[PDB]
Amino acid sequence: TNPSLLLTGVAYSAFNQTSSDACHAAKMLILTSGESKYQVYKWTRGDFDYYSNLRDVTKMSEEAGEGSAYQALAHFFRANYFYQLTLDFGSIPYTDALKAETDANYQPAYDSQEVVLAGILKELEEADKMLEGSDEIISGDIIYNGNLVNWRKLINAYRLRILMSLSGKEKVGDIDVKSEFSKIVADGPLMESLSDNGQLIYLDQQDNRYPYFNDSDFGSGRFMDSTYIAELATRQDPRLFAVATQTPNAEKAGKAINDFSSYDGGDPAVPYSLVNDKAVAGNCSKPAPRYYQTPTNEPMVLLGYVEQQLILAEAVVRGWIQGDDKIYYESAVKASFEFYQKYAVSVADYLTQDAAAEYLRNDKVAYSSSLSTDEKIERIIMQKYLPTFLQGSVWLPYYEALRTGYPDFRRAAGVSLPYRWMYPQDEYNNNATHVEAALNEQFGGSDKTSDKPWWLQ
Ligand SMILES: [Cl-]
Ligand SMILES: [Cl-]
Ligand SMILES: [Cl-]
């Protein structure tokens, strides 16, 4: 082996992450054949599966030369997995992780969420610095074909993602959140267009195909959530056509593809049996068939230009940086249309830049200085949320709803949105002392999905 071969594997695994479960929690999909615990906020324990991925990252770093670009990339991959892990749980193994075998008698101590977040922000800072000005020629880079500047852009965008998630904090470790954010924007580099997306391209070849291709979970029981359809339809958003089918009955009636009334979903917060009746009757939309019938569908975007620009828009509104928030917002929306136009081939004519410009003039979408601050934030977060259908943002749109309040996810009376996940049973079984110490440091001994983690306090 060699680091190039290992990079290919590490990069594929990281950039191929996606979560249909998250899309139930984020009110895009429903299950009508049974109760989805994600749809109705009944999850309990999470899992530590990303530690296996982290062990592969470690192997790639150990095989590479000290100070090499591969080592910089390892910091990026570590940051991405640790960020996702800490958002799930709070305190997690970090500094003490990955030093013994997974099945060793020794199991790792947990670091506080603040320590993890500050740590990975510093790892990303180090990665950006390591790559700066580098003439190193790497191989196996299936994301950016060896362009180290593109990696720096992605690293910096990721730092902004993390920092914006910490909008409720002045400091994280010794890092001043707003001043660090501003410094990164000033220094750059940042993604400049959709071409700079941190995304994985799929190919019609063994082990290289889109992850939902021929996924059996797309048959019976899977439909669009009525609230997501409504968010799109009320904005006259033609990305609706790209993500969803018409209802079977609307198709039968010969309603136009761009007739917003020909799309409908099921109510996620009523008993599923009632919504199954609506779906059986032919009155619910399903995910577009390209999501499971095409071997390359669309690239999986770990972190893209659309999100980056909307992070920047929010930072302007919050006063963290100067800039034109309207054009950050509009550049993001326009780029999202450009993305869907490429991959939603059957509805591409509705997704031109002329269509984007019209969409941006719609009620509920149009952005201007006269809007209230809360309205601006809602606009921005909504545009971050809408294009994350079956995408590489994984649970992040759910956590952004916890941070910002947007969207306000439909749920039955008395149902709370979980803040986090409980620790895996395996941790209680084999790492009990360290788990107990983590619960005592965080929540006075409690481990509940309703325990509010540090980043939201
Ligand atoms: Cl090397
Ligand atoms: Cl570990
Ligand atoms: Cl478990």
Side-chain angles (χ1 to χ4, degrees), residues 1-100 102-457:
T1 69
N2 72 56
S4 306
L5 293 174
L6 298 178
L7 175 58
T8 301
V10 162
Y12 194 95
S13 171
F15 286 81
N16 185 59
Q17 300 297 324
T18 183
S19 176
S20 63
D21 297 343
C23 291
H24 287 77
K27 293 282 145 290
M28 296 171 161
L29 294 173
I30 57 171
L31 179 67
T32 63
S33 54
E35 186 180 75
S36 161
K37 73 177 81 68
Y38 308 107
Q39 182 180 324
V40 304
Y41 304 112
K42 287 182 190 186
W43 66 82
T44 56
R45 304 180 190 279
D47 67 64
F48 272 18
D49 295 351
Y50 277 165
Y51 285 95
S52 72
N53 307 58
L54 280 160
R55 286 176 187 279
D56 298 334
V57 173
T58 304
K59 288 182 213 89
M60 189 268 294
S61 190
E62 288 172 351
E63 281 294 298
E66 300 310 292
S68 67
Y70 295 107
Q71 295 200 339
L73 273 36
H75 284 297
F76 169 80
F77 291 113
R78 281 170 49 85
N80 172 55
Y81 286 134
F82 283 124
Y83 181 57
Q84 294 182 57
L85 282 160
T86 191
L87 284 180
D88 284 349
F89 297 106
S91 303
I92 56 167
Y94 172 60
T95 62
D96 201 41
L98 315 176
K99 292 166 175 185
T102 194
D103 57 338
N105 289 7
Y106 186 74
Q107 294 289 315
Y110 288 36
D111 289 341
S112 73
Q113 178 163 75
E114 188 171 4
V115 164
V116 175
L117 290 170
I120 64 178
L121 286 164
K122 294 285 186 50
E123 292 195 56
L124 287 165
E125 180 181 27
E126 178 64 7
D128 167 65
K129 179 176 166 185
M130 288 174 74
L131 294 177
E132 183 172 17
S134 176
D135 301 303
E136 181 172 1
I137 298 158
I138 65 168
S139 299
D141 177 7
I142 53 164
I143 308 299
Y144 291 129
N145 307 316
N147 190 328
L148 300 183
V149 176
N150 274 124
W151 281 103
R152 290 186 70 212
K153 290 173 168 178
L154 177 57
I155 287 157
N156 290 331
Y158 211 103
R159 295 159 77 186
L160 299 184
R161 162 190 275 181
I162 295 167
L163 289 162
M164 185 51 66
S165 75
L166 296 175
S167 59
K169 303 294 186 181
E170 291 299 330
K171 306 268 189 209
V172 56
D174 59 29
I175 301 169
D176 186 279
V177 170
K178 299 186 288 303
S179 77
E180 179 83 340
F181 187 105
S182 187
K183 180 191 174 175
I184 293 158
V185 176
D187 293 350
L190 293 173
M191 302 186 186
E192 297 181 273
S193 76
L194 206 64
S195 298
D196 289 342
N197 275 10
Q199 65 191 19
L200 180 59
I201 302 289
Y202 297 107
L203 298 167
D204 188 15
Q205 311 178 358
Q206 190 185 359
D207 302 316
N208 295 340
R209 300 190 172 90
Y210 184 78
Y212 299 110
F213 179 57
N214 286 327
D215 178 345
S216 284
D217 285 327
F218 281 88
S220 27
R222 176 162 292 178
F223 294 88
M224 302 306 296
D225 184 302
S226 174
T227 69
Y228 180 49
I229 299 296
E231 296 290 5
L232 292 158
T234 57
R235 291 172 175 78
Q236 293 190 289
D237 196 323
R239 294 171 296 183
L240 173 57
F241 321 148
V243 300
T245 69
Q246 292 179 303
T247 72
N249 292 343
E251 205 177 286
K252 276 163 63 274
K255 290 191 167 186
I257 289 292
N258 71 341
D259 178 350
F260 285 91
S261 76
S262 70
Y263 304 85
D264 204 351
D267 183 336
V270 300
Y272 68 82
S273 184
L274 306 179
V275 181
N276 191 66
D277 296 332
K278 181 182 181 179
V280 168
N283 293 314
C284 295
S285 297
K286 287 177 86 61
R290 65 183 178 89
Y291 287 91
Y292 55 93
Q293 295 192 329
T294 68
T296 72
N297 189 28
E298 65 192 35
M300 200 59 68
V301 181
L302 181 151
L303 175 52
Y305 180 72
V306 170
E307 179 184 341
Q308 179 194 267
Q309 298 296 87
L310 292 163
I311 290 165
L312 295 167
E314 184 177 355
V316 173
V317 171
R318 294 187 182 275
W320 297 15
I321 56 173
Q322 299 308 303
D324 182 338
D325 44 324
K326 177 177 180 291
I327 69 181
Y328 278 133
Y329 173 87
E330 295 187 330
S331 72
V333 173
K334 290 174 191 185
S336 181
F337 275 58
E338 183 189 356
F339 183 89
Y340 280 112
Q341 187 189 31
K342 296 177 200 196
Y343 305 113
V345 184
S346 78
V347 295
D349 284 342
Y350 300 104
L351 295 164
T352 64
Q353 292 294 306
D354 278 341
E358 171 191 329
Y359 174 72
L360 281 167
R361 291 189 284 262
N362 291 347
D363 301 341
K364 293 187 70 173
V365 180
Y367 193 102
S368 66
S369 52
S370 68
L371 293 179
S372 72
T373 298
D374 289 340
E375 285 169 321
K376 287 175 181 161
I377 295 305
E378 180 169 16
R379 286 284 209 272
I380 291 161
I381 299 303
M382 180 64 57
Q383 293 302 323
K384 292 180 75 186
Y385 164 77
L386 293 169
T388 64
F389 185 66
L390 293 179
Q391 263 291 340
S393 300
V394 287
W395 283 84
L396 298 184
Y398 178 78
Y399 296 122
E400 183 142 65
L402 297 181
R403 178 174 70 85
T404 65
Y406 310 118
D408 196 352
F409 295 140
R410 173 139 162 85
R411 54 201 186 273
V415 177
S416 305
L417 295 174
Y419 286 118
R420 62 179 290 275
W421 301 69
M422 296 165 47
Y423 294 106
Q425 187 60 53
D426 185 56
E427 289 297 296
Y428 280 95
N429 293 347
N430 299 119
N431 207 5
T433 296
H434 287 145
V435 172
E436 174 65 2
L439 301 183
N440 283 333
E441 291 295 327
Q442 288 178 104
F443 309 128
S446 180
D447 187 13
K448 300 176 177 71
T449 63
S450 57
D451 286 316
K452 183 149 65 167
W454 181 78
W455 76 283
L456 295 165
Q457 290 169 16

